């Protein structure tokens, strides 16, 4: 094992100031309910892109 430097707040700032993994941008809703979902899946009450694919 070897160590020339312990990384400063400013050195680690290049991994804590501009990185991206998510943005939660706008999201999706059906005209029947304002409870938000993601762009391409079926909701728990059976709604999908205007086709209402399973009912219980």
């Amino acid at each position: 094992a070897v160590q020339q430097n312990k990384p400063t707040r400013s050195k680690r700032g290049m991994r804590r100031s501009h990185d991206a993994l998510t943005a939660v941008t706008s999201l999706s809703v059906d005209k029947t309910s304002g409870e938000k979902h993601l762009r391409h899946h079926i909701t728990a009450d059976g709604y999908y892109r205007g086709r209402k694919v399973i009912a219980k």
């Binding site: 979902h37 993601l38 391409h40 899946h41 079926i42 999908y48 694919v53 399973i54």
Partner: protein, 120 residues
């Protein structure tokens, strides 16, 4: 190595995968709709969807076929009676598979699979 493979390598040994999809197809002819993971729902289409075409003939030359897997009388009670003959003038497309989001409290991919025509 490997090159083309269209089927999923999934998890665990080949006899596990065999005895999972054998049993899960039994559950599909028992309920006509299943809630499961996206890889499982989409790989369950294999052999079971063309088995509807195999069963459409009601013929004696097919009588010893389609009972190599899922060997519980639940399937042969429907096979060549309604399982097959219920889709015999549609020309293909007997299963539907669509995604439902993520497993509740984690990130595993959830989906559903159905037979396109079912009594409930």
């Amino acid at each position: 190595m490997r090159h083309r493979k269209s089927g999923r390598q999934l998890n665990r040994n080949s006899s596990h995968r065999q005895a999972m999809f054998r049993n899960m197809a039994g559950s599909l002819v028992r309920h006509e709709i299943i809630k499961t993971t996206l890889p499982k729902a989409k790989e369950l289409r294999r052999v079971v969807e063309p088995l509807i075409t195999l069963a459409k003939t009601d013929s004696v030359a097919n009588r010893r076929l389609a009972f190599a897997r899922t060997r519980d009388n639940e399937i042969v009670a429907k096979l060549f009676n309604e399982l097959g003959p219920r889709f015999a003038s549609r020309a293909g497309g007997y299963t539907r598979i669509l995604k439902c989001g993520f497993r509740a409290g984690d990130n595993a991919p959830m989906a559903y699979i159905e037979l396109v025509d079912r009594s409930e």
